[PDB]
Symmetry: C7
Subunit: 76 residues, 7 copies
């Protein structure tokens, strides 16, 4: 039982809102639909935020894992 | 269900997409094919800047390591 | 003496400081990690030069962004 | 089910292409061959800067990791 | 002659200097390392421009940030 | 019939080449050998800047990941 | 009969060399060993920051992925 590895723990967020910070300072929010071991992700109803402003609505999007800094839980 | 990201990408073949690259370039076009490295081939592609078409390229091969995200966007 | 990734096991459930490429810093409790150095922290906070820029809660950090990991001190 | 990207690139062999590299740099030439890393060999290659030719290089081997995209040239 | 990573073993338990990409630098006692060059330092301190910016205690440094590793000096006395 | 890039490079052994690196450094010398990572050994190597020889290095080993492209020097 | 690059590098063992790094740092010293990643150990190492000595290091282990080129010194 003693603690899931990080990529297994990530599965606990499937179908939940998440916050993704990317290299280069970009930030996105959306519902996590799937991921793989490279940390590539597919999000639904995604938006890109900038200085607290939604600067773009990305709909369903695939984010390439090597651009990611961190993934955290979003409002909800 | 829910396919892994690279399998789910198959559902976008023949759909219009928006590709954002590292370093800010953006491309819009119809996804024709892809592979495991995320290398992509788009038809009727154009490069954009600030919501502006700066170049019309037709069919282009995009190297996968340059990709930040692939979006299906909004109507 | 344990190899680096095995010694890190010593910090599970302990407060840590994660310094990233770009000067961003995270402080939180280490819950798990994997061989790529991907990490899960609980009660995490993000910092931009001593200033707590955000309270994340549980967060997954991609290992390729890490510069170092050191011992921190727990919150209240 | 169409060709994977690197298999489709084979249809441009002996044709004019535009190679965009990271850093606004760009090459034009006839595609002679390539490999799985996307390293390429171009004939009658010319390097460009802001639409203007900077150097005529002749045959050139370009390392794949420098590539942003490949498109066809109107040559 | 030993290969680089094998010769590094001779520096275990000795003070070293770790120069990183971007110029920071760490000084401390080398406790262990692995084949990716990740390493563990005891009594570590971070420096920038030669001035110590913080004392970290025991630290795990990810290897791909390393430029070089050399030996450190002991206190002037 | 169509030599892959790294096999074709072998045809430049012992001839003058020009190597452009990331960050715009440029070297010229006689290609002596190379490997699959594109690491190279050059004889009579010279570093160039702006267009002028800024350094004479003799025999040099260049690490492949720094390379942008390799082309033929002058006879 | 030419040796592959990493094999040709063996010829410089126990000889003075110049190591130029990504960014721009430069080191001079005697090459003692290396591995397939191009990590190197130099003896009597000295760093040069634009034409001249800025730091004497003694023995140093340079990580291979930082290297741009290696040439014969002196
Ligand atoms: O689908 C893919 C394939 C590779 N990659 C990246 O390519 C590298 C592949 O190996 P890695 O997953 O162990 O890091 C690494 O930088 C990955 O993030 C993706 O991000 N997505
Ligand atoms: O000790 C190490 C481990 C990896 N590396 C680097 O990591 C990569 C590993 O691939 P390589 O085994 O082909 O050299 C490559 O870019 C290396 O230069 C080092 O330089 N030193
Ligand atoms: O045709 C290819 C081959 C590889 N890569 C990926 O791009 C990076 C280039 O250094 C590698 O990590 C590799 O996974 C591509 O994008 N396209
Ligand atoms: O999910 C993953 C998979 C791999 N890596 C590591 O990060 C680097 C990304 O290029 C690789 O060398 C790999 O070892 C991660 O940080 N996270
Ligand atoms: O001769 C070589 C060796 C490696 N690579 C890089 O190493 C990765 C191997 O998949 C590719 O993405 C590619 O960019 C090259 O471009 N050329
Ligand atoms: O814990 C790790 C795992 C990977 N890497 C780096 O990631 C790449 C994984 O193949 C290597 O080149 C290596 O430099 C590290 O520094 N530390
Ligand atoms: O001596 C070496 C070893 C590796 N590489 C490059 O660094 C990557 C290491 O996995 C490979 O794709 C390879 O092209 C070099 O340039 N030189």
């Amino acid at each position: 039982v003693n603690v899931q590895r990080p990529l297994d723990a990530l599965g606990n967020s499937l179908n939940s809102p998440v916050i993704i910070k990317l290299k280069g300072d970009r930030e996105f929010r959306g519902v996590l639909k799937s991921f793989d071991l490279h940390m590539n992700l597919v999000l639904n109803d995604a938006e890109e935020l900038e200085d607290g402003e939604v600067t773009r609505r990305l709909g369903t999007v695939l984010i390439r894992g090597d651009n990611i800094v961190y993934i955290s839980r979003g409002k909800l």
